[PDB]
Design a protein around this ligand. Structure first.
Ligand code: HEC
Ligand code: HEC
Ligand SMILES: [Zn+2]
Ligand SMILES: [Zn+2]
Lengths: 136, 137
């Protein structure tokens, strides 16, 4: 009941991006440029289906540098992961939540079974706890 | 056989990188906004350090953004820029054909000069085969 590191996530479908700048409520620890990636099974849930077991969403978070009014991606700070499994992750609404420091498999960030992540994502109960929407 | 194809299905390609260009930056006009770069399989071979096969396509996808409480949030697509690799067909602009599609729409072709204006700037990157983007992790 550990969330698996999502190997190969960089090849997945890019859902959307967003920039969180200093002063935003989510600045700690989610400040920077982030990109949302979805594997094939996650796309089915985003498209209006049910999320099948095995669906994975990744929040990929980079630092950035402001250089002459351009924001340039720097280093990866972390990834956030949601893995769908209605049985194994029932305590947190059927998604398992993990963070990986710097995107590395050995740097697990979550220490409370994913309850803190869950507490905020629960506001999106109506949409299977996922905030991101497909855009074209 | 000098027209760049609209790159259908580009949104499911590999996302290379992103950048934000804000007011004040030298390129705000016309490339202001949040942009994402996508590459098909052939372009990845070229980005990786391999050579670019004919048929390689790189997409610059440009969105306006809105400021919302210390967040920049994606707004409407302004345009896509497309580079399509064909050493013989597009030899006049370095082996890449350049096109722009207004709001990403296949009917809104933007380029009127055979790609010369696009090529004039990308020519600065002769040494990486006219491509500014670099792979990252
Ligand atoms: C509110 C205080 C949050 C906490 C705590 C966590 N997340 Fe989150 N998450 C939040 C928002 C507002 C968004 C949308 C960002 C956007 O670009 O729209 C997200 C997104 C994710 C995603 C992408 C899928 C989605 O739901 O949109 C993942 C994979 C994700 N979050 C994981 C995650 C983990 C593992 C957390 C605890 C370490 C966690 N989130 C906390 C808001 C909040
Ligand atoms: C300088 C004045 C430019 C002109 C005119 C054009 N482009 Fe460009 N392009 C420029 C830069 C600095 C970058 C990199 C952006 C980044 O995030 O690093 C780009 C990128 C592209 C790409 C992505 C591939 C790459 O070379 O990195 C495409 C497909 C591309 N540009 C197409 C394009 C077209 C079709 C143009 C005329 C309509 C065009 N570019 C003009 C700088 C400049
Ligand atoms: Zn403020
Ligand atoms: Zn600035």
């Amino acid at each position: 009941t550990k969330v698996k590191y999502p190997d190969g996530f960089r090849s997945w479908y890019h859902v959307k991006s967003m920039v969180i700048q200093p002063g935003h409520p989510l600045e700690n620890p989610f400040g920077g440029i982030h990109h949302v990636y979805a594997n094939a099974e996650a796309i089915q849930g985003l498209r209006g289906g049910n999320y099948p077991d095995g669906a994975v969403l990744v929040f990929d978070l980079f630092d950035y540098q402001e250089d002459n009014h351009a924001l340039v991606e720097g280093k990866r700070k972390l990834i956030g992961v949601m893995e769908r499994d209605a049985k194994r992750f029932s305590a947190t609404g059927g998604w398992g939540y993990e963070g990986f420091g710097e995107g590395k498999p050995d740097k697990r960030l979550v220490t409370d079974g994913g309850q803190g992540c869950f507490g905020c994502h629960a506001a999106q109960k109506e949409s299977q706890y996922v905030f991101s929407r497909l855009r074209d």
